[PDB]
Amino acid sequence: FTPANRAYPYTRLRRNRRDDFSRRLVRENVLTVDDLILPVFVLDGVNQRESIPSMPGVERLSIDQLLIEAEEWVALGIPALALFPVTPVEKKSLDAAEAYNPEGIAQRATRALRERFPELGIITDVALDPFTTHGQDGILDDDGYVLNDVSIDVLVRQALSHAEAGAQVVAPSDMMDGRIGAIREALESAGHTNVRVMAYSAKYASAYYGPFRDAVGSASNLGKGNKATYQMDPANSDEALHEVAADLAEGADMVMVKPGMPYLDIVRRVKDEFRAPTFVYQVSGEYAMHMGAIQNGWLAESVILESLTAFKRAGADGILTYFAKQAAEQLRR
Amino acid sequence: SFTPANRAYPYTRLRRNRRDDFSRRLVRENVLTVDDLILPVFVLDGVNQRESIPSMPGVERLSIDQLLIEAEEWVALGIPALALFPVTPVEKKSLDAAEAYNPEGIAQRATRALRERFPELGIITDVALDPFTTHGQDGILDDDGYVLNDVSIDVLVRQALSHAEAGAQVVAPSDMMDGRIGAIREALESAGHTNVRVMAYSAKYASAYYGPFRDAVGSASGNKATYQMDPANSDEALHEVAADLAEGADMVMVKPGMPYLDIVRRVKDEFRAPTFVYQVSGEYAMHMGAIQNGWLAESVILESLTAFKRAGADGILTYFAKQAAEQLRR
Amino acid sequence: FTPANRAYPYTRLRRNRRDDFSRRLVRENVLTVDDLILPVFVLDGVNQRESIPSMPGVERLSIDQLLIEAEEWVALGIPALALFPVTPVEKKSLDAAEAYNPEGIAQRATRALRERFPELGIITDVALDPFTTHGQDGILDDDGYVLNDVSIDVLVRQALSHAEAGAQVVAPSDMMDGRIGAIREALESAGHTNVRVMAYSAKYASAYYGPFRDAVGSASNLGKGNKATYQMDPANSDEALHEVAADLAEGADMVMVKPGMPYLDIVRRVKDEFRAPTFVYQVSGEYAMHMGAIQNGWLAESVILESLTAFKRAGADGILTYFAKQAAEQLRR
Amino acid sequence: SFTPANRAYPYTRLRRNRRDDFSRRLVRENVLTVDDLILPVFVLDGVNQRESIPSMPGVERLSIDQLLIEAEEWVALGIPALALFPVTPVEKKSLDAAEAYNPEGIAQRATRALRERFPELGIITDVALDPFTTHGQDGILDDDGYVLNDVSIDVLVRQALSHAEAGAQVVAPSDMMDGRIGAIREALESAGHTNVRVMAYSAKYASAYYGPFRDAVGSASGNKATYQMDPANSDEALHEVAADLAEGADMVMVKPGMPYLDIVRRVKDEFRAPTFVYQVSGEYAMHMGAIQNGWLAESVILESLTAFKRAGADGILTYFAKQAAEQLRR
Amino acid sequence: FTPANRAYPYTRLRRNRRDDFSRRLVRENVLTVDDLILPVFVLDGVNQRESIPSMPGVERLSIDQLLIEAEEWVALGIPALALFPVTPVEKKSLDAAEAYNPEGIAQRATRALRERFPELGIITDVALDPFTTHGQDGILDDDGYVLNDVSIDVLVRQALSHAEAGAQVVAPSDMMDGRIGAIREALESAGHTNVRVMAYSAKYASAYYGPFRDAVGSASNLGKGNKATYQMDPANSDEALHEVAADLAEGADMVMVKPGMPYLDIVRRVKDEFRAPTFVYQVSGEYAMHMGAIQNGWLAESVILESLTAFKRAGADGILTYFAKQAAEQLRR
Amino acid sequence: SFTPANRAYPYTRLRRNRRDDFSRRLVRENVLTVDDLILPVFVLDGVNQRESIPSMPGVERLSIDQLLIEAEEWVALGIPALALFPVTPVEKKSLDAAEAYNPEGIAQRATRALRERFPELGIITDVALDPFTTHGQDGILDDDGYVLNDVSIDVLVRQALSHAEAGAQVVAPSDMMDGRIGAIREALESAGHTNVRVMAYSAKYASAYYGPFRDAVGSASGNKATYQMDPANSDEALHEVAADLAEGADMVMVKPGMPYLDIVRRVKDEFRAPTFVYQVSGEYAMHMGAIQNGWLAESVILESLTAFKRAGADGILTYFAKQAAEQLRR
Numbered sequence A, C, E: 001f002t003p004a005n006r007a008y009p010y011t012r013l014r015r016n017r018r019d020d021f022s023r024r025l026v027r028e029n030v031l032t033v034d035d036l037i038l039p040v041f042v043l044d045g046v047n048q049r050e051s052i053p054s055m056p057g058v059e060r061l062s063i064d065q066l067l068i069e070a071e072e073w074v075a076l077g078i079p080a081l082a083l084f085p086v087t088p089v090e091k092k093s094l095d096a097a098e099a100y101n102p103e104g105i106a107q108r109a110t111r112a113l114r115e116r117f118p119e120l121g122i123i124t125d126v127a128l129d130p131f132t133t134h135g136q137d138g139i140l141d142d143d144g145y146v147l148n149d150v151s152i153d154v155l156v157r158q159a160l161s162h163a164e165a166g167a168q169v170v171a172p173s174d175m176m177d178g179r180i181g182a183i184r185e186a187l188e189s190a191g192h193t194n195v196r197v198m199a200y201s202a203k204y205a206s207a208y209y210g211p212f213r214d215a216v217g218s219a220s221n222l223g224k225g226n227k228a229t230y231q232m233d234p235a236n237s238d239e240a241l242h243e244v245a246a247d248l249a250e251g252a253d254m255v256m257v258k259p260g261m262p263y264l265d266i267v268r269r270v271k272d273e274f275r276a277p278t279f280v281y282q283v284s285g286e287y288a289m290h291m292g293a294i295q296n297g298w299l300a301e302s303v304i305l306e307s308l309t310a311f312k313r314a315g316a317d318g319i320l321t322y323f324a325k326q327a328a329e330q331l332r333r
Numbered sequence B, D, F: 001s002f003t004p005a006n007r008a009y010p011y012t013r014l015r016r017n018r019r020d021d022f023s024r025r026l027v028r029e030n031v032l033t034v035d036d037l038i039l040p041v042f043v044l045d046g047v048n049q050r051e052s053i054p055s056m057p058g059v060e061r062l063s064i065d066q067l068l069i070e071a072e073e074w075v076a077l078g079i080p081a082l083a084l085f086p087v088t089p090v091e092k093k094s095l096d097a098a099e100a101y102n103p104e105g106i107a108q109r110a111t112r113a114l115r116e117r118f119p120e121l122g123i124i125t126d127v128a129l130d131p132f133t134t135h136g137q138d139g140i141l142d143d144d145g146y147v148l149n150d151v152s153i154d155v156l157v158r159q160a161l162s163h164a165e166a167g168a169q170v171v172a173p174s175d176m177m178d179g180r181i182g183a184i185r186e187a188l189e190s191a192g193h194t195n196v197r198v199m200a201y202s203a204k205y206a207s208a209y210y211g212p213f214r215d216a217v218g219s220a221s222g223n224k225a226t227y228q229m230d231p232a233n234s235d236e237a238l239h240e241v242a243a244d245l246a247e248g249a250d251m252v253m254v255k256p257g258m259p260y261l262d263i264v265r266r267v268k269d270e271f272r273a274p275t276f277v278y279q280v281s282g283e284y285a286m287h288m289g290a291i292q293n294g295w296l297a298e299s300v301i302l303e304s305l306t307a308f309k310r311a312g313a314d315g316i317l318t319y320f321a322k323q324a325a326e327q328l329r330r
């Protein structure tokens, strides 16, 4: 960068801050509804709405209830939903076969939403964690290690069942090496030419996933287990560039940094280095922490749009956020 | 900077994101909002007057009362700022351009009237001598017909001060005299006008695109290649901006607009400062003419304005600002 | 960039502007006839010259009339023509078979010009829009979507018929993914080793194509249809770099940004990043808008060379411009 | 800068290094140590006083004797520095903010007491007028309610000098007046306070995250968008830091912290200077609230602090500093 | 870099140096035990401990003695050992067959350590120099030249016997072209998916290897021979970038610069350019030279941590150092 | 900067160029020549004296007549410059370091004697107070034992002037006081010493490697972390060099040498200025000790010196300069 010899008092950076109109003129970034993705927790059955104690204001919804709520999500202009099925306990297995069940919640919810709301983007989740008795994102070997290439075999079948259900976007969150190219290849081979792959590229072994694990019901399955053999070390930044570079090479249409606010520097570096469609997840713990402080009267509602503007400023094109309705509503007005 | 990352067809198909509206909206790199818009307005001396301009279809010169009336609609649409260009009566032109610093000149009157009735509306005054000289040249001429640099700056400074006294939040020197940004900043600071912004017309080309504006303001009674920039020069625009930043400009502008998008892009990339671009009278008329003739669909207006945002402009001075602001509200 | 601490009054940038001679010495870019490509609209039949109301001063020309006009284009030193055939209504089809007809206007015009003017560069257009009843650049599926790889099959046959006719350059304007490498491969396989591919790399879904659509007669076919599923979003800049990077990798000899003046920042970035032979189209709407303002007395003729100098300054090596004769004439003198 | 080097699955499997603790530790790019930690502390006027703060669970305001007692534990843990924030009695607030430079103001007293009993402990004083004004604004107001720049700097300078006289090794201007770093540096040098460090709050955003701190210090009886930075602006933070470095800052700070990691990263990459970040009261409370509610595991605290190191911060002002220092000792 | 116009006396860089606390706050790099790899010389037989005259304080150790010493290495938190077997004279050959003996010292020591200390990283050495009668790192042709691809055949068999013994890391020190990709391929083919390859990427034809050659017993075998046809020319820096780029492309998980302190500029460039896990060897001559000066009373012990901090500052993530115990002990306290 | 160009085994085999001496010589990136060499020499007060130094095997302190005798051999070998380090008699040390600017101090005498008998030989004097203070500290101490910055600069300036008067072509301030390069340059210019070069010891670390030199010069009767650089810091060295260049240094130096090659590399890459590196007494002794012990072959000396050239140094201050110069002649 070139400072161009700017010096007080010839340069006073408060002059542009003097008035709202100049503030607005020079303002570098804005959040719009075109930046918003709403994740939703999807229940089996009919007429089901379940509160989540660790994500106040967020509800698990059966497919019929989801179709009704989606009327307003669409009316607000929200471009896409990311679906997270809440797997019945009895459907969890060692082999995660429910992942690719054409009658699984994810697949049924896709078919229903694609028919009801043809313009709404549906992003499915490619990962085994909602389907395994152990709560890990893949298949274990006899050492209890998440097998890479064997897991990809199952993830591929899943991705294909999502495309078959009409999902415009599949989002592998699993963090297996090479899964973007394996899923891309399979989609291509099968004629699913236009199904986007939204890679979770730099997805960290984070402590901020707690509430979501309660929400999808994987928390009791995982127990004290951790994902440090596949999810990325929080301390590592350069390594995120290698992750993204491979996912681009492998065919990803979009690349994602996960967690969001605790990793904004990663967003910045990924946008700067690759100049590709860049996505960020404002995860369940980020949401819970803001919502808990707002409900306590400790922070003003306005932190919501402040937290979301940060993602734009950092370089994200789109934001998966549990705040997406609240935000769209505030936008809107 | 830029890494292809070994992206290769068919693994990479750049049309997947284009497949649907929802994914095009998600990845869409830039968006024009009314926050980006500045409306230039031509201001008359009388009351209850509007005049049409043959080379600027749909643009009216307004007397100050009409300006106030119309500004109600501009403010309602959320347009942040106006850029005022006085249409000087012939009796008020001189070799000394004294009308430039007249506390009752059209720009000064318009400014006080606007600042009082719409206190949140940004007013950007024009610092230049071309509406005030008998030959309309942007400065004072010597005996060979040359536009004197430092002597013109003395008049421009008096002018900028009069604008700051009239209440203008921004003065915009468009004259292209060397060193004027610094001289104006110095004088503003010495006079205690600490918060008056200076929007430098930094890289302002010796263009053929200003023709309609010259009819608009009545300056059309000659070239400016000794002060305005040679259209061929790009590296040069970086030196012009570096100086204006060092001299204290709060925002820097590239002029003409669309014929110079590459300059917007270099200026934003290199300096990372508030960057402005003028979509000039000639751009406006070309587009407007083609639309009215039925040659071009009217969506070319948002396409042109969108181009400014993509090239790196923060704000756009454009005669389209009202039309664009209405399309963005609808 | 390094400002090197240059400060008024030690640095006065008006000193070089003082005199024509210093102006000329430091002037960074110049337009010459070596930068000019003339597009031409080519009619069937004999002795045909048709005015285009939305492109004043431009005529559709039968092949005999084109050969006569070309005498002066060559005398002026214009390096190349880009041919755009005006397809008879009765020859438009679903399958676009006329694209690869050895007796199609494009093919006949190539053979005639290559024989008459052996040094003149002939650039043919690879695209189905002049041949389809729907006016879209490729073959539609049952959803009315432009099929990518199926369209490339037809585009390849077309490119081959152009090479067979003697075209030194083929210019795929179609914006299908991967078509540069498919056309390159086919040309290579068939022994057309030296046929250049001039890729329309970063070709935007623009509103500035109106007059050309009237000129080639595709406007009534297209109707209200749009090309947003293949032509690029006007808002997108980083994405242009990915487009060009792939076309280079795929074998393009030249890469083109289209529209021209509304996308000069793209020209700048493409030249800066790739350092490759870079081309820009000053499209029909750009031409119409300048010509309409000049005829109205609103702009001086001099905007023509100003608009063309911009392309040089921005980084283009060559410019496809309907002004190419006027410009060459003004150069010339 | 960055070269992918044609790395491709399966030759490249980024999980191999993740396979085992030993290889994760070897390649681990960043590590938080107590060397990175600064504890902000809220200081009361009395003796034998502690108060709890509703919006800052687990944080106590301490009178100076309690501060000394607690500092024994902070020093033992190896915490390098405290950042003092006085809780000004209501009787001591004024329009002129004179209490700011009172040689017996809470900050000044706390500093002398600390410098004497823990001479190796770093004391960072707050240079700002918001704990001293009746309206708590960070400067002196004019008649339209505007925070006067240069007039406020005059008071900030008197304040910084009083801190240097009290023995402070670092004064930290948090006020966001233009040019204050230079004016403070000039005055420090003229007075022979050659080694007093200035830690500029350089890119300090007009944030909603300061709510709990305003309760903590008692300033909660209004916005600061005319001086604090617009949250949307990034390029702007580079200009703010460039000026503060030129003006003589020894370290530069980004504030808020985690909602601005991208700014930490740009600031460190571009300037390669000592870079500091404040994990503000709102960050602390959000995390603390979620942990106590059972929503988040307490390892999110080290994860947040680790994020600062990775983003490029050298030092972190954080209300978590004692907790983190104990986890690093255990 | 941007100096930002910093000028004395407004900028005095001694202000941060004034006090220990500010020193500590701004200190850019720190050595920790997570950066340390201990190389060890491994003897055949039982109850063997042999001093090395050119590496004072370093001992060759039989496997039983190595298991006992390793108790404290682990207690100190040292992440990994690099094993260097001391080949019996009678086991040296033309064909280096002992390299891949499942009962070779390296293989036996791996199996023993992997079983006794499951969390300790074991890095094996892939190179023929401890096994050849000539002391060169590969197989000679009839001109006495080290054959590239023939040597790789043997190195591959070795690497495989190391994986089979349970080594988590193999470190080819041989400097044959292409050996990283050959070893990677073989490991992959054989299902050794997670065995890391720590490439000696920019390994110089150095004079600083003397003491180690005495330690492993290769010095008398090598004689006056040199390795200039494979080990890198000390004068060459740009060439190191090409070396590393290829090893990354070929699948290395970590890349190493060798010697350490005489090549810190190489460390800096490799980290800066590639942003990959970067390793550096503080070689036997570096160790001997510091230890000799410390024992003579010519340098303070404190040069040890100074020499090791240099590697962190230069850009290394991990350091193979004979000082690793001393350092860990000093850390520790 | 760096493009791998898709080079891949077996098309690319980097050993082909290594196959033969002739191709290794052709591609060989750097070469040490005697043009790169500066010999530091320890100078005694007497006549007909040489002393051995226990921690610096093979290095002798020489009285000025012995220096002249030996310099005949250094000049013949083509060594461009000496760096003089006086061994001050105990009687000549003081709190005020006055012996530093004594026109008959050892450095000053040695310089006149050298400039007269070998007028083409470069003489680099040491600007520092550590050979002259009773506590040997590089400056004047205040009452807390702190090395005063500006007060020390006053003495260093007097010293540098005395060297310029004695005929020195280069004065080399090794003291690490802030701002000294500028103060020395100013004083040299004011006194008409227009062509006297200043070789700044710019990035001079608080090292353990200076131990043998302290025995050599007799300063060994304490640390310098308040002025010499923290070994851990790299970005910091860029700021140190930027200042010294701005202040007028003709060449900039990194000290210690081999433990800081990464700093040489950053300094040359970023500033592209004449860059010097000191291979310090501790480096010399480590190498020398290992060679004599039979542990290392003597080719490690050229390897170490070659490393400096590769890292980006133009010139090397090295106690090996005579040995290396003889190997380069043979």
Ligand SMILES: [Cl-]
Pocket (backbone or CB within 6 Å): A191, A192, A193, A194, A195
């Ligand atoms: Cl599809």
Ligand SMILES: [Cl-]
Pocket (backbone or CB within 6 Å): B192, B193, B194, B195, B196
């Ligand atoms: Cl003002």
Ligand SMILES: [Cl-]
Pocket (backbone or CB within 6 Å): C191, C192, C193, C194, C195
């Ligand atoms: Cl051919």
Ligand SMILES: [Cl-]
Pocket (backbone or CB within 6 Å): D192, D193, D194, D195, D196
């Ligand atoms: Cl001080």
Ligand SMILES: [Cl-]
Pocket (backbone or CB within 6 Å): E191, E192, E193, E194, E195
């Ligand atoms: Cl394995």
Ligand SMILES: [Cl-]
Pocket (backbone or CB within 6 Å): F192, F193, F194, F195, F196
């Ligand atoms: Cl001189």
Ligand SMILES: [K+]
Pocket (backbone or CB within 6 Å): A034, A035, A317, A318, B025, B026, B027, B028
């Ligand atoms: K978006």
Ligand SMILES: [K+]
Pocket (backbone or CB within 6 Å): A024, A025, A026, A027, B035, B036, B314, B315
């Ligand atoms: K804007």
Ligand SMILES: [K+]
Pocket (backbone or CB within 6 Å): C024, C025, C026, C027
């Ligand atoms: K020229």
Ligand SMILES: [K+]
Pocket (backbone or CB within 6 Å): D035, D036, D314, D315, E024, E025, E026, E027
């Ligand atoms: K630190």
Ligand SMILES: [K+]
Pocket (backbone or CB within 6 Å): D025, D026, D027, D028, E034, E035, E317, E318
């Ligand atoms: K490490």
Ligand SMILES: [K+]
Pocket (backbone or CB within 6 Å): F025, F026, F027, F028
């Ligand atoms: K050579």
Ligand SMILES: [Mg+2]
Pocket (backbone or CB within 6 Å): A175, A176, A177, A178, A201, A243, A246, A247, D014
């Ligand atoms: Mg991955």
Ligand SMILES: [Mg+2]
Pocket (backbone or CB within 6 Å): B176, B177, B178, B179, B202, B240, B243, B244, C013
């Ligand atoms: Mg200028």
Ligand SMILES: [Mg+2]
Pocket (backbone or CB within 6 Å): B014, C175, C176, C177, C178, C201, C243, C246, C247
């Ligand atoms: Mg393409």
Ligand SMILES: [Mg+2]
Pocket (backbone or CB within 6 Å): A013, D176, D177, D178, D179, D202, D240, D243, D244
């Ligand atoms: Mg500031």
